[PDB]
Amino acid sequence: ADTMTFTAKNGNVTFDHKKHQTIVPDCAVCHGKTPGKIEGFGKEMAHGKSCKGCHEEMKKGPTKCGECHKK
Amino acid sequence: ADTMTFTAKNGNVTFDHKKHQTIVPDCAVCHGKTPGKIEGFGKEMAHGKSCKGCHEEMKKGPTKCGECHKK
Numbered sequence: 813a814d815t816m817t818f819t820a821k822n823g824n825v826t827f828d829h830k831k832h833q834t835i836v837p838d839c840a841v842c843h844g845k846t847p848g849k850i851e852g853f854g855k856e857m858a859h860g861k862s863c864k865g866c867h868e869e870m871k872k873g874p875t876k877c878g879e880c881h882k883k
Numbered sequence: 884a885d886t887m888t889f890t891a892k893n894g895n896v897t898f899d900h901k902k903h904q905t906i907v908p909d910c911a912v913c914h915g916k917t918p919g920k921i922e923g924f925g926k927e928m929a930h931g932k933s934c935k936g937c938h939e940e941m942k943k944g945p946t947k948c949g950e951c952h953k954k
């Protein structure tokens with residue numbers, strides 16, 4: 813439906829945008845004031861606040877390498 | 884499901900893999916013998932035969948930078 817697959821040499825990472833919208837109901841959490849592309853998105857942001865950091869803080873969702881990176 | 888994102892400093896590239904699976908004759912066109920991770924995939928391959936080259940040769944699909952790279 814609205815799943816984004818981010819390529820990574822160590823295993824692609826599948827992100828269900830629609831599901832995340834259903835459970836994080838404020839776009840601004842991920843996008844600030846402009847839902848759309850996230851400037852700079854890549855490894856550093858994904859391993860920080862844009863992906864892994866939320867999972868770590870909320871104790872829900874993937875935090876170990878292999879939970880995201882699927883060979 | 885629905886799209887792949889190839890992160891790039893000059894604008895991420897969104898790629899409808901399923902659509903390409905449908906219209907492009909055989910997985911081997913992009914994957915060789917077996918579908919799996921495309922070793923080396925990146926700028927050189929994308930600007931060559933893996934992406935842009937097909938679009939140019941077959942006169943269908945994006946060949947201009949901004950048609951693929953979106954900020």
Ligand code: HEM
Pocket residue numbers: 818819820821822825853854855858859863864867874875876877878879880881888889890
């Ligand atoms: C210590 C554990 C991890 C290691 C060693 C690791 C390794 C890497 C590496 C090497 C890359 C760059 C890939 C490339 O440029 O081809 C990358 C990117 C990425 N990682 Fe991880 N990763 C880990 C944990 C995670 C986790 C837990 C997540 C999910 C929450 C994640 C999500 C991502 C995403 C989405 C990208 C790609 C951003 C883009 O598309 O450019 N990683 N990771």
Ligand code: HEM
Pocket residue numbers: 816829832833836837838839840841842843847848849850851853888895897
């Ligand atoms: C209803 C609230 C939201 C709206 C309206 C929204 C909208 C969008 C839009 C328009 C895109 C661009 C798709 C494209 O490139 O064509 C996008 C991408 C994205 N969204 Fe959301 N989103 C929302 C909530 C969220 C949430 C809560 C998260 C984090 C959990 C999130 C994470 C992302 C990520 C990682 C991308 C890919 C960014 C990129 O490729 O640069 N979104 N979103």
Ligand code: HEM
Pocket residue numbers: 825826827828831832835836841842858861862863864866867870872873874879880
């Ligand atoms: C692009 C960055 C992100 C990636 C790659 C990512 C990836 C994932 C994956 C693979 C799952 C498990 C599969 C699923 O249930 O859909 C998941 C679950 C989850 N994520 Fe993320 N996520 C990202 C960003 C975020 C952010 C920024 C937050 C919080 C603000 C968040 C909160 C959650 C939560 C609460 C779950 C648990 C879902 C459940 O238990 O049903 N994620 N995420």
Ligand code: HEM
Pocket residue numbers: 819889890891892893896924925926929930934935938945946947948949950951952
């Ligand atoms: C002359 C026009 C173009 C320029 C100047 C350009 C520029 C670039 C640059 C600088 C990169 C490397 C990005 C990075 O390392 O962060 C890149 C990679 C890439 N470009 Fe282009 N590009 C052009 C045309 C195209 C077109 C037409 C397509 C689509 C058919 C395309 C698809 C890609 C893809 C898929 C990557 C690889 C991103 C990744 O590593 O995942 N480019 N391009």
Ligand code: HEM
Pocket residue numbers: 819823824882883887900903904907909910911912913914918919920921922924
């Ligand atoms: C039905 C035929 C196809 C199958 C079964 C298939 C399967 C796959 C699989 C399993 C992956 C993930 C590989 C990984 O672990 O990274 C993948 C990624 C990819 N495929 Fe396909 N594919 C097919 C057709 C195509 C076609 C026709 C193209 C080119 C037009 C293509 C281009 C790509 C690209 C660029 C990736 C991302 C890079 C990568 O992850 O290796 N695929 N495909």
Ligand code: HEM
Pocket residue numbers: 896897898899902903906907912913929932933934935937938941943944945950951
């Ligand atoms: C990973 C490499 C490639 C990338 C990033 C890429 C990207 C795109 C994009 C952005 C479009 C326009 C949006 C869409 O119609 O889905 C497109 C269309 C198209 N691509 Fe590719 N492409 C790739 C590889 C290929 C290859 C190898 C072929 C031929 C073997 C091909 C054939 C086509 C065709 C025929 C269209 C036209 C679809 C239509 O008219 O509706 N593409 N591609």
